[PDB]
Ligand binder design. Structure first.
Ligand SMILES: NS(=O)(=O)c1cc2c(cc1Cl)N[C@H]([C@H]1C[C@H]3C=C[C@@H]1C3)NS2(=O)=O
Lengths: 491, 147, 49
């Protein structure tokens, strides 16, 4: 059953169309086949989109797969909600709940709010691009008003190429006025690779700055530039290379010839092409389940004018979309589930931070569960709170009256407490205030030389340092060492 | 449908209104078919051919009014249906003149909840105790909000 | 390698000990913040030059 479908592709989406051609024969043909009529046409001109849509409707296909632009989403929704034709896309998700649209891209906005609340920022700048839409820009301002954030948002998208070396300099020098430190970028990969190069030219990737990329292919762009910088860069992945089917597709994809499939003979892949690959799995599962329920999709006639007055559609497409919303398979993004509208739920997004060796993950974020870090504590050097032994003596070391409500190093008070604070301030170490067990100053045992008290805590490797009323003798220099004396006294 | 019908009728001059959703469709037809279109609707953003528009721009006057009243911190309630060009405009001057701007959408709220949602909105403004409000909507929303 | 590891901010200072000071690349660290000085024996302002 070679079923007629329609395909919309931009002039330049070569990796995505190549991935579609791969997924065409990656798994098919025990059954129905597909008849893809491909339209390598533009996406900006909605008149061209209209011409292509009426041409594929004159073909009279059952499903249309492709992309759209923000100058075209109204056109696609307005025609599909009329003519009841199911439309499937990997582009940015729509704003209103629209019928007959299945959209392959998960949300980013809740993840990004989770990330900001994890890093605990208060004031930052937000470079956005207009041509991807403004849904995230609308979303962040609400939580900025509620969570008392200070947002300086700046449009950057409409700047021409021919002044695109000094516009950015003027922009970041204006950011120098408030002395900005925290930047969230929201662009396409080309604008990312332009702006990173201009930042690395003007020298703003030292230790001190911090960057968040708001995309899905965090490692799909260039990161060898600012890998060794000093700044810290975090982002998001939906394609995780550690998994079995993922690495299988990596090996299969790397072994292909670049001349047959352009942009395919690499190691990594674009997330757009990954969702394009998973779309074929969903679209084949659909007709699989319709032959499982044995419901015929016989058009039984021709299609006609898309300007039919009034046009009347056919509700077996409603049943097609109904079975589309029930598909649940595993793919490159992981599990998939749909809502009552065609939006994706049941996804998982990895949080990816750049380090010196390269990118790595620190945690995940679910559709309902918040940011769950994976406890990747590779911190091999922790400055240990050193062992400080003492004994209770007024006014050297005294208890406070509210010691149960307070905690630890706050509980003790006196001359020695103040002094140990001064020593730790000058020497930069961490410390924890402890008490000797046996409550003595300490002397040696007869015939066994067992130094008890605070002496054996330092002799026997138990305690680390002792700021305490201890007297320099002759018999104590042989086992421990003293500094210069700080307070004189006598019997 | 209506535009294809009247061009089939052979119209010499097209006139009509447009909302924020049909504007790309109308300019995309008019750039191709070279038909002079006239409108009182909201002005566009890019320089598009064959579109004459009677409603003048507003953004320079509104920025001049802000500079005359000599403000630094204010709230800004907007509706999405007329466009977001003014919202994109005032944020740049906020970035230059270092303004403290809180901007909140209002256009999504349905009619069955427009007694308590607005109250919650003004209570959340009174968390900061705002004194200076720019409303940016249509006349219907203005009459609904001033009450 | 300096411009990769990020050591051309305001604060650093460089002296090139050659004769073709502008014969090498200087568009890289022109906008840096550091200051670079060197030597020329070929002066482009002159008539025969
Ligand atoms: N007046 S006191 O007992 O509190 C006191 C006693 C002493 C102080 C400082 C004070 Cl405030 N520092 C001296 C040191 C300073 C120098 C000279 C000897 C030591 C090095 N040791 S000390 O003679 O033990």
């Amino acid at each position: 059953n070679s079923i007629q479908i329609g395909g919309l592709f931009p002039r330049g989406a070569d990796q995505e169309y190549s991935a579609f051609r791969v997924g065409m024969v990656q798994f098919s043909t025990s059954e129905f086949r597909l008849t893809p009529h491909i339209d390598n046409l533009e996406v900006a001109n909605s008149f061209a989109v209209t011409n292509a849509f009426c041409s594929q409707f004159s073909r009279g296909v059952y499903a249309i797969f492709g992309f759209y632009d923000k100058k075209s989403v109204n056109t696609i929704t307005s025609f599909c909600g009329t003519l009841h034709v199911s439309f499937i896309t990997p582009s940015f998700p729509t704003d209103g709940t629209h019928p007959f649209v299945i959209q392959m891209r998960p949300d980013l906005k809740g993840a990004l709010l989770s990330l900001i609340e994890y890093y605990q920022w208060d004031k930052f700048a937000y470079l956005y691009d207009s041509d991807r839409g403004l849904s995230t820009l609308q979303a962040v301002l609400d939580s900025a008003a509620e969570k008392k954030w200070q947002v300086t948002a700046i449009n950057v998208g409409n700047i021409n190429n021919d002044k695109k070396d000094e516009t950015y300099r003027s922009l970041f020098q204006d950011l120098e006025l408030k002395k900005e430190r925290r930047v969230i970028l929201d662009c396409e990969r080309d604008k990312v690779n332009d702006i990173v190069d201009q930042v690395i030219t003007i020298g703003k990737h030292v230790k001190g700055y911090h960057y968040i990329i708001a995309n899905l292919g965090f490692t799909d762009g260039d990161l060898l530039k600012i890998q060794f910088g000093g700044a810290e860069v975090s982002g998001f992945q939906i394609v995780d290379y550690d998994d079995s089917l993922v690495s299988k597709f990596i090996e299969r994809w790397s072994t292909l010839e670049e001349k047959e499939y352009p942009g395919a003979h690499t190691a990594t892949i674009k997330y757009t092409s990954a969702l394009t690959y998973d779309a074929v799995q969903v679209m084949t599962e659909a007709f699989r389940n319709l032959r499982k329920q044995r419901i015929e999709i016989s058009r039984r006639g021709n299609a006609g004018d898309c300007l039919a007055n009034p046009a009347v559609p056919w509700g077996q497409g409603v049943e097609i979309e109904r079975a589309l919303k029930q598909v649940q398979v595993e793919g490159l993004s992981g599990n998939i589930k749909f809502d009552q509208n065609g939006k994706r739920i049941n996804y998982t997004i990895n949080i990816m931070e750049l380090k010196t060796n390269g990118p790595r993950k620190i945690g995940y974020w679910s559709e309902v569960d918040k940011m769950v870090l994976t406890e990747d504590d590779t911190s091999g050097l922790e400055q240990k709170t050193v062992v400080v032994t003492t004994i209770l003596e007024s006014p050297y070391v005294m208890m406070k009256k509210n010691h149960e409500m307070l905690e630890g190093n706050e509980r003790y008070e006196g001359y020695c407490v103040d002094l140990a604070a001064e020593i730790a301030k000058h020497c930069g170490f961490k410390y924890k205030l402890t008490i000797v067990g046996d409550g003595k100053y300490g002397a040696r045992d007869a015939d066994t030389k067992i130094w008890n008290g605070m002496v054996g805590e330092l002799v026997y490797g138990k305690a680390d340092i002792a700021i305490a009323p201890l007297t320099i003798t002759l018999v104590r220099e042989e086992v421990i060492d003293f500094s210069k004396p700080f307070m004189s006294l006598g019997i």
